[PDB]
């Protein structure tokens, strides 16, 4: 501008705001999708459940004894059973609109819980502080997915986009989000790239917390 104002820095600075804007939208609506407290709050807290049941079951087949594994558990963890019964009793009190009593049991629970424990609150916490990780793991791997999915849409068509399988689109999303960027799977569609910047912006920032947390868990098994 120190020269009767520059022409170049006119028709371009507004052409870029037209490109970022796209991403900002794609990005913005991704933080909404995974933000839907009804859509995402169930999809995640569910994906989580299927993580355990489908896990525990495996740690159960590696024992030959299917139910054998089940008893060994209800056994090594005694509280797991009197707790279940409380849950059932609280729930039958609830189902009957008998909340006054529910008020009670819930409290008569805390006591019963404190008592039978002192190194117990640790096992419950270390367990809670455990499902929380499993929660995060979802939320993240979930946002990753979108990117993957989104890249699928605008890439599946074009000739030899490398992004054929829906899985192939996940590989790209994951490799990208981790910043590893192998490269065996790049978009190839000028538009698929516009999106790639958002999947990158998101997937990395998101994957970061994960690794960040997964990296705190490690500095504990090494100490």
């Amino acid at each position: 501008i120190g020269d009767v104002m520059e022409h170049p820095l006119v028709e371009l600075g507004v052409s870029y705001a037209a490109l970022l804007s796209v991403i900002v939208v794609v990005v913005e609506c991704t933080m909404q999708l995974s933000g839907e407290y009804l859509v995402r709050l169930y999809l995640v807290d569910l994906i989580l459940v299927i993580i355990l049941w489908a896990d525990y079951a495996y740690r159960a087949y590696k024992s030959g004894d299917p139910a054998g594994y089940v008893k060994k558990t209800l056994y090594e963890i005694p509280a797991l059973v009197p707790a279940g019964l409380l849950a059932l009793i609280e729930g039958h009190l609830a189902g009957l609109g008998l909340f006054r009593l529910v008020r009670l049991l819930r409290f008569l629970r805390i006591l019963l819980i404190i008592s039978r424990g002192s190194k117990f609150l640790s096992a419950i916490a270390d367990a809670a502080d455990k499902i929380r990780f499993y929660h995060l793991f979802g939320a993240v791997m979930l946002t990753v997915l979108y990117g993957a999915f989104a890249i699928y849409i605008v890439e599946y068509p074009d000739p030899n986009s490398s992004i054929k399988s829906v899985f192939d689109a996940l590989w790209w999303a994951v490799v990208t989000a981790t910043t590893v960027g192998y490269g065996d799977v790049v978009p190839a569609t000028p538009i698929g790239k516009v999106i790639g910047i958002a999947v990158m912006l998101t997937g990395i920032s998101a994957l970061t917390l994960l690794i960040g947390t997964v990296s705190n868990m490690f500095q504990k098994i090494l100490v």
Partner: antibody, heavy 118, light 109 residues
């Protein structure tokens, strides 16, 4: 000292999902009692639709059972109602109340009108 | 659908008069699961009497409730203007909750 607030579209086209968002304040929907949806028809009939309680277990009404879906968002302290494919008859005034001991509903929301029409 | 039936349908009492309403169920209902609400014109219902005879909050003692089985009764020791409204009983037996057809009540002036 508490209050729930119906909110959402006041009009829905035949066979489309009717939606509502009750956001309660002054109490937690995850502490106790049942939070249910009650709709009042033009004839001034009152029909309980169903609920979701502090523990998050839903109890719907048989008649709506195949269309209704009460859910909630513990975070923002608000539960919602969803009705698949409403019809001219589903036009009524939906409102959320709080079920207490023996299910007496002590706190009713403002009441939200919802018209189904083209 | 343990249907509740209220009577009368309309009711035109006069200031000072006493008066009673009725709510009868197809099946029987536990006295502690019977409730009454008072819906004033263009407002949502207000809990008026819970568990048959227990008066809800701000409800004045001019009111009262009693009964059991398959027949309950809401009674006003004396009506007053502020009483114009519609009363609905509510029960909980089977899965579905249920309300009566209400009982309008207009005072005579």
């Amino acid at each position: 000292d508490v209050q729930l607030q119906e909110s959402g579209p006041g009009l829905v086209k035949p066979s489309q999902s009717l939606s509502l968002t009750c956001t309660v304040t002054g109490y937690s929907i995850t502490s106790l009692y049942a939070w249910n949806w009650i709709r009042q028809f033009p004839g001034n009939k009152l029909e309980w639709m169903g609920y979701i309680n502090y523990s998050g277990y839903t109890s719907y009404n048989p008649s709506l059972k195949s269309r209704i879906s009460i859910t909630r968002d513990t975070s923002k302290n608000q539960f919602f109602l969803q009705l698949h494919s409403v019809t001219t008859e589903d036009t009524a005034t939906y409102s959320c109340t709080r079920g207490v001991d023996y299910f007496a509903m002590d706190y009713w929301g403002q009441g939200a009108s919802v018209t189904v029409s083209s | 659908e343990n249907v509740l039936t209220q009577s009368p349908a309309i009711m035109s009492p006069s200031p000072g008069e006493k008066v009673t309403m009725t709510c009868r169920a197809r099946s029987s209902v536990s006295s502690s699961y019977l409730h009454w609400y008072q819906q004033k014109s263009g407002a949502s219902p207000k809990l008026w009497i819970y568990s048959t005879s227990n008066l809800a909050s701000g409800v004045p003692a001019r009111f009262s409730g009693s009964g059991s089985g398959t027949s309950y009764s809401l009674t006003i020791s004396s009506v007053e203007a502020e009483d114009t409204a519609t009363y609905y009983c509510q029960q909980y037996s089977g899965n579905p909750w249920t309300f009566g057809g209400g009982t309008k009540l207009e005072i005579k002036r």
